[PDB]
Every structure is written in C-alpha cells, then in structure tokens.
Amino acid sequence: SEITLGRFFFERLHQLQVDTVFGLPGDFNLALLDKIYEVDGMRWAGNANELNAGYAADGYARVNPNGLAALVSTFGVGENAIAGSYSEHVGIINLVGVPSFKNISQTSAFISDPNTAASEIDRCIRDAYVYQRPVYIGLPSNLVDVKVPKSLLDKKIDLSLHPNEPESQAEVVETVEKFISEASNPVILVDACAIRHNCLKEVAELIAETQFPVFTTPMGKSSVDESNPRFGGVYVGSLSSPDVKEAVESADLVLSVGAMLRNVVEFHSDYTKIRQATFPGVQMKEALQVLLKTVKKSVNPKYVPAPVPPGNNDPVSQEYLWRKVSDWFQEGDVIISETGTSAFGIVQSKFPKNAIGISQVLWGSIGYATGATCGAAMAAQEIDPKKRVILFTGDGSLQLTVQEISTMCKWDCYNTYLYVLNNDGIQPWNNLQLLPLFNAKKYETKRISTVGELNDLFTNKEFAVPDRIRMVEIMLPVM
Amino acid sequence: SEITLGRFFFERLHQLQVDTVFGLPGDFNLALLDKIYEVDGMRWAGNANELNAGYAADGYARVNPNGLAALVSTFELSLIAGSYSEHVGIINLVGVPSSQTSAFISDPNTAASEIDRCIRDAYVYQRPVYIGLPSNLVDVKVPKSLLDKKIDLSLHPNEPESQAEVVETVEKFISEASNPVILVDACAIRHNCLKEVAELIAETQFPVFTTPMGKSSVDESNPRFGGVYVGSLSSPDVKEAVESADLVLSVGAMLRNVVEFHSDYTKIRQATFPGVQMKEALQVLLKTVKKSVNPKYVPAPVPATKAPGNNDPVSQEYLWRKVSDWFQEGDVIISETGTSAFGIVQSKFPKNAIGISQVLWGSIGYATGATCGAAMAAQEIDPKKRVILFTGDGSLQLTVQEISTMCKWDCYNTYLYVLNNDGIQPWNNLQLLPLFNAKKYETKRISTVGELNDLFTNKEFAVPDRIRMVEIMLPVM
After folding, report:
1. Could you say which residues bind pyruvate 2 here (chain A) (predicted)?
2. 3-state secondary structure A22-51
3. With an 8 Å Cβ cutoff, is B30 touching chain A?
4. Which of A183, A347, A420, A442 stands the most exposed, by the fewest C-beta atoms within 10 Å?
5. A432 and chain B in contact, CB less than 8 A
C-alpha cells in the first residue's frame, strides 16, 4: 500500500506513456535502476554514454504522444544534448543521481524533504510537459528507497494550460481579424513550436477556413501535410527557390504560427506579436482555437485563393535523391535528417501525411541524428509496429554516436532505415559492416552507386516493410 | 618576428614534448586549431567526443616524460573529475566567446605569462588546469623571442621547519618500529619519486608493496617487493604482511603508526604537516634514514610468489601469471575497472613498465580511451615501446571510436586484449580494426591454453610493427 520514491517516478513516466528510460548505468543511481523492473512495461535502453542518451531521449520525445522523454544521469561523469534540447523546446525529464547548468533546463528540483518529494517530481513532470523543455530532478541515493502512499499516483498530474486572460485574447483575435479583412494576399507560415505545443489540427483547421497559401520553415517541416493543395513549399529566405521566395515575400499579411525566432501576426507559446505590438501571456494553442471560431468571416475582401508553387548508370546526384525519396515515403513515417548535406537536402523532399520531422539544423550538434534515431525507433515500437523510422546522415556524423545503432540492434528496432550518404567524407569506415558486427538478429544492408539501383530499392515492395533493421549506404560525388 | 597568441600556446606544449592535442573541433576554437599546423611536429588527434578526449589526454599524460597532456574544449560539459583525484597534469584550453588553477586571458599584456604560469602549475602540481581564451585574443601578436625564455618548472623548496619536524618524527617511529612496511601509490609515479622509493627500499631493507593504482612504481623483481595490497581483496599472505605492520611508510597515498607522504603535505598518525612535498621530504629522509632503522630489526621475508591443460579453457588465474612471460621492458600495461583491473594485479610487471589502471575513479570505458593517448605518446617517444590494453568486451563499447583514432594515426605499438566472458549487446569485436580500416593489422581469437601459450611464444607477434586485437574467451566465472 506504500511504494518506494524511486518507483513513484517510473510509475508517473508510465502514466504519461514514457516506457523507455535513457542513460548509462552509474553509482548513486544503480539502486534507482532496480525500480524500473518493478514497473510492468518499462525498459532500460542502456546507451553507450550520456551525450548519446540525451540525443536518444530527444528523438524519443519527438515521437512520444505527450512530447516527453526520461533521461537518468549521475554526479560528475554523467554530466549539450540538453543545451540543444532547451533551445528547440523538447520536454526531457532529467533525473540526476547525487550522493547522500541551471541555464539549459526550465526548472531545477533538489529532493531534500521526503514529504514534498512526490509533489516536487509531479511539478517537474508537469513543467516538462506544458512548457516542452528539459527539467533537472536531483535525487540523493538515501531517498530513492523512501516509502510514500500508492494513493499519490491516483491524484494524476494536472497538465492543463492556465487559460489566456480573455481581454488580451479578445484584443488579439479582434486585431488579427481586422488585418485579415484588409489583407489582399495573406500567407500562413508554420515553424517548429506549432508541432511542439500541439497546434497541427489547429493549423489544418486554419488552412481550411481561410484557403490561404501555407509554407513551413525547415525546422517546421512536417507540421503541414505537403499534399495539401494550399501548401506552397519551404521558406528559407534568400536560399528559398525563386517561386517560393516570391509567394511569401509578396504577401501583405503573414500569419506566422510558432515562429521560434509588413502586417506580421506571430503566434508564440508564451505570447502573441502583431506588427511591433507584443501581447504577453496569449498562448497560441487557445488563441488559434478562439480564432478558428470566427476567422472564416474575416477573410472576405473578395479574396481569390492565390495559386501556390538522369541515366540509370549515372551516379545518384543530391537533386535526384531528395525528389525520388518522396515516392518511397508513406503515412506516419519519422523522417530524421543530420546537419550537413542531409539537413538541407531533405528540405526539397515532399513528406507524406502525419510525417514526423526531426532535423536539428538550428542547434546543429553533429552526431545527433544517429543518436536521435535510436530514441524515435524505440518510441515507434511502443506506438505502432507498422510505423517506420528513417535516418539520413553523412558517413562522418554517424561515427560520433555510432554505438546507438548497437542499441537499435539490442532492442530489435526492425522499423529503422539507416540511409548513410557517402561522399568521401575523417577515417573512412566499412559502414555496412556495423549491423552484422553489432549482431542484429534480423537485418539487410545495400550499397547504392547509380540511379537504377536507387529506383529499384524504392519500388522494391519487400524492402518497404519494417520486418528488419536496414542500412542503405548511398554513394555520392566528392561535391 | 611576432607570432599569434594561439601559436605561442602550442609552441610551449611542443617545448614540453606535448606533440598531440586532444578534443573535438567546435566554434570559438576553430581559429585556434589552425595554429597547430603552423607548429612543426604537432598533430590534432581528433577524438569522437570530449569525454573520450579527456580519457585519451589522461593516458597520453601518463606516458609523456613530463607527465603533461593538452586538451582543447569549447564553451566541455561531460568531462577531468577522475584526472584531478588521481593527480594527472592535463592542460585544459577552453575556447570561450568574445581543476587546480583557473586562468581567464582578458589582458593581452600578461596573456603569455598567464599561459606559462598554467603550464608550470600543470607540470609541478600534476593536476588539470583550465585556460580561458576568448576567440578575439587567439590572433593577438606577441614576440617569438618569448619562447627562448623557457617556463621555470622548478619546485618551491619545502619550509625547513615542517620538513625538519617530519623527518625528525618519521625517524623516531622507524626506531620504535618492529615490523615496518613501505606502501607506494600512484602519486609516487606522478611526482617523480621512483629512484627515491628505490633508494628507500635499499637503505631500510623493509618489505615494500604497491596499490593497484601504484603498480609499476616498484621493480617487482626487487627481492623486498611483497606484492599488491587491495585490503580485504588482497591474497591472505599479502593481507597478513601489510596489516601485521606496526609502522606503514605510505608514499603517494591518494586517499597504528601511519606516515603518508603526499604531494602538497605529509601525514603522521592524525597529525597533518601541510606544505611538506614528498619529493624533497624523501630526499632529506634518505640522507639519514639508515641510522634510524631499529638495530634489532631483522629484514622480514616477503610473502606469496606462489604457482594447465592445452585443450582446457583459459582461466583468470592462468592468463595473469603467464602474461608476465610475454611482457618486456618499457611496456605500457593498461587495465580496465572490472575483471582486468583486479586480474592484472597478480601479474608480474617488467622493468620500466608503465601501469595505467583507473581502479580508484573507476570510470567505465576509460582504459580504451586512455590506450589511444598512451599509443600516440609512445609513437613520439620510442617506436619499440609497446602499449598493451586489457579490457572487458562491454567497457570497450563506451569509447570504441578511439580505436578508429589509433587506426587513423597508424598506432602499430598497441595490443588490444579483449577479455570476452559472455558479457549488454555482444559485438564481433575482431571486426572493428578492419571496419575502421587499419592500414596494417592482426586479429586473433583465443579459446584454449594452447592458443594463448603459442601467441606469447610467437616471436613475430611480439614486435610492434602493426596494431593488433586479441579476443580472449573466458567462462561467465
């Protein structure tokens, strides 16, 4: 009828669907790791080191329904994976084991008093979920085995947003709708925070009710079904295609949604911005819901919905890969991209419906995508066995966090595709040797030099089934 | 001629024989990494991540003549805690936007002097040293003539009184002592007190033992050497000889009548004499230590030194005893926390052997990381100098990328003995060297005594002409 404090933690993670814990086993948390095997459904990923585990945790959080992941660390050795998690808003629950970086984590919690310990853990899990940012939880070894009532688990953690103050909300939905009426050629622009703070149906509803052109950032790619006839591509300012650059920069009204950072309405998590006016406390989620109720009637200044944008033996070019990759993708696919050729190549690729984008371009922490893939893989397993997890990475980037491919093998992650873009770089490795070396129970490797080989692979129906873990090495020119 | 501040740093490292820089390239130090290729002889190791680079740097420092290694970081998280507690002089240069001693280089007048002071403190106190260098200052010109004035690395003399009081008191206990013993830990190796220890064994004829950490501090052929103390886990005969003693002369203990000689201080019973540095303390002790020895003292005998089916599987017992036959002078013997760290204890080390066994801090993956640094240091010192690693198959995985580093820099001096015991995810460990593309290599699995006995007697295998990995199969026990 009373449970250990250590167990309470893992039982809370289970309630919020976080059924994989990342980290490297270490002294002062070993007692805590025993608790995992008391909770039915939990598993210990067992990563090579902590840096890798943080990447893994991040990836896992981007695929978790609640946007949450659990990472265990230890004093000293145990602690950048969290520095780049914070700046890209991902709710990693950090539990540091301490004996018996307040900048790059939302709320610190030091569990000294076993009376308020449960409450302190709950406050941190809530803050992780709501604000979608990392959260440190200090737990001394002596306290991991302190009994607390099992009834504490029945009082489920409140994860509700504090309602927007009606006045500021009313003033924003009023003003925004005025600009919409004035707007000749409005556009919608969706960035990552739209994905993060769960505003994708809202964005879908907004595209329908306005019939405005919609574009995403690289970081906000997969926020919008790219088969939507209102989708007009990926804006990257100067580096955008001339036709996409035109459509966005021609607009007199931009409805920016979740912009991380003319008539510009920027919807943010904590606040809303209209031109140079800032309305602090106006959270986008509710703002957008209240907007959709009446947005239809605002958009009728006689607006006309605006229109929106190699030889089989020849070596596979960047251009040809990213266009033809579109044909192979399917609904629900986790598309992961590494900083480098992959991160900007994948931009031009067309994504399927309910696609999940994971491309650390903003923080650009080399090795992340391979690390992250391990987390996304394990999260997909727990969600939907048919859900495929595809990685595009340079051969170099792979090396830094290579051991997390062993983790994928250990947990029979038969949903993951490991596309390794080789371009002569570093120390060259026989990358196709990794899966058999790491002892994947079921696997397939394939080198691809020419267009013909690539076209076969994607049209191959048996290859498209996640029945085994695969690594496809794609040879590219030194350029 | 005026040179960049960034270059001055690497030129100073070169003077002190630190001809390899560890770290992962990052923004705010990229400008600094260009300077390395201006200095003739320097190379950028290029490690997989920073944690690994620190392990590498540590290993490198244990093989460097001056006990020094250079590590570059950027504004560094997962790092040096286990370097500090085991006294190793890692020079930490953190690249910042525009550990014993911290130095932030703000003023380009005292910058050179500040760098010199840090390099000196690393060397003298044998501990990590952070050096803040803002990006804007890495390209600040200074005279090349500054390099002609070599850094003073001379020790501050011990304050005579504390020194005199210690050598007095210690010698009183020695006179009273019935069965004294000597115990040598790592800091003896670190602060250059091995001839001192040799001199002390001669002049006293006392039994001498080392810690695991302090193994290779004493020539194990010395007839006064009585093995490796590990408290409760020591062999009963070694446990007896040390714990029976009424006086213990502990030398470099990192941490009855106990004299502990430490780097910054000396301890006699519960009395602490701060400022009494062991190096000079021991020199002053040796001058008069002979006459202090109890006249009644009979040199006490040294315990243990105790003692095979070719088809039978290789047992722990048999490996560590017969490994002794294969070892040679100058060999770097590295051991991982686990089966290796405590197994290697029983092994007999050759003359001028270098022991590297992080048992104290026990940071899993270290030994494989460290091996990469020791390897590169041995290359620069003596091409005949062999670097041997014993690690569990699991430990290897954590810092595996540093074997690719060994391959990249053609570390043909390193032997990678991988003790397999059925484990974690089992790997085909022998596949690593060919996957990492070692230009010259040899792999060998060893299941039975016969295969092992062949390997050690094999004359061509014993030459460091290629990088090797020997997988040794063991029972779960």
Report:
1. 129
2. ECCCCCCCHHHHCHHHHCCCCCECCCCCHH
3. no
4. A442
5. no
**Options 1.10.1200.10, 2.60.40.10, 3.40.50.970, 3.10.20.880; CATH of A318-475:** 3.40.50.970
Residues 6+ apart with CB under 8 A from B348: B220, B221, B321, B324, B327
* Break sites following residues in chain A (C–N > 2.5 A): 79, 100, 261, 309, 425
Point out the residue among B427, B428, B435 whose CB comes nearest to the CB of A429.
B435
The tokens 């005279």 sit on which residue?
A: B143
Q: How far apart are CA A350 and CA A222, in angstroms?
A: 9
Work out the minimum CA distance from B427 to partner chain A, whole angstroms: 5
Query: Where are the domains positioned within chain B?
Result: 2-147, 160-292, 316-473
Q: Do the Cβ atoms of B51 and A46 come within 8 Å?
A: no
Contact yes or no for B262/B144 (Cβ under 8 A): no
- Chain A residues with CB-CB distance to B432 below 8 A: 437
Question: Given an 8 Å threshold on Cβ–Cβ distance, is A438 in contact with B425?
Answer: yes
Would the CA dihedral through B36, B39, B40, B41 be positive or negative? negative
CATH number for the domain whose boundaries are A166-298: 3.40.50.1220
Token representation of residue B213: 């950490």
Question: Is residue B470 classed as helix, strand or coil in its secondary structure?
Answer: strand
User: What is the DSSP code (8-state) at residue A315?
Assistant: B
- Between chain A and chain B, how many beta carbons pairs sit less than 8 Å apart? 81
> DSSP per residue over B299-321, as a string?
-PPP-------TTSBPPHHHHHH
Given an 8 Å threshold on Cβ–Cβ distance, is B397 in contact with A49? no
Chain B residues touching A436 at Cβ < 8 A: 428, 431
Q: Which CATH class is domain B316-473?
A: alpha beta
The residue whose two tokens read 């900007």 is: A344
**Chain B CB within 8 Å of residue A367 CB:** yes
Question: Which approach determined this entry?
Answer: X-ray
Contact A403 B398 (CB under 8 A): yes
| Cβ count near A200 (within 10 Å) | 16
Within 10 Å of residue B255's Cβ, how many Cβ atoms? 11
Amino acid letter, A318: Q
Does A407 sit within 8 Å of B425, measured CB to CB? yes
- Shortest CA gap A380–chain B (Å): 21
> DSSP string spanning B240-285?
HHHHT-SEEEEES----EEEEE-SSEEEETTEEEET--HHHHHHHH
* Annotated binding residues of B for thiamine diphosphate: 339, 362, 364, 394-395, 421
Interface touch B401/A402, C-beta < 8 Å: yes
CA distance A320 to A325: 8
Residues contributing to the annotated binding site of B: 27, 123, 339, 362, 364, 393-395, 421, 423
Separation in Å, CA of B134 to nearest CA in chain A: 20
Contacts for A158-162: CB closer than 8 Å, 24+ residues apart: A158/A126, A159/A66, A159/A126, A159/A129, A159/A130, A161/A130, A161/A283, A161/A285, A161/A286
Question: In this structure, what DSSP letter does residue A165 have?
Answer: P
Residue B408 has its nearest CB partner, among A79, A367, A427, at A427
Name the CA radius of gyration of chain A, rounded. Answer: 23
For domain B2-147, the question of CATH label 3.40.50.970 is answered with: yes
Measured between alpha carbons, how far is residue B202 from residues B128, B223, B257, B258, B290 in Å?
34, 11, 21, 20, 9
DSSP code at position A324: H
Pick the CATH number of A2-153 from 3.40.50.970, 3.20.20.370, 3.40.1190.10, 3.30.1360.120: 3.40.50.970
Would you list the DSSP string of A122-154?
HHHHHHHHHHTS-EEEEEEGGGTT-EEEGGGGT
Please answer whether residues B283 and B218 qualify as being in contact, where contact means their C-beta atoms are separated by less than 8 angstroms.
no
CATH topology match: A2-153 vs A318-475: yes
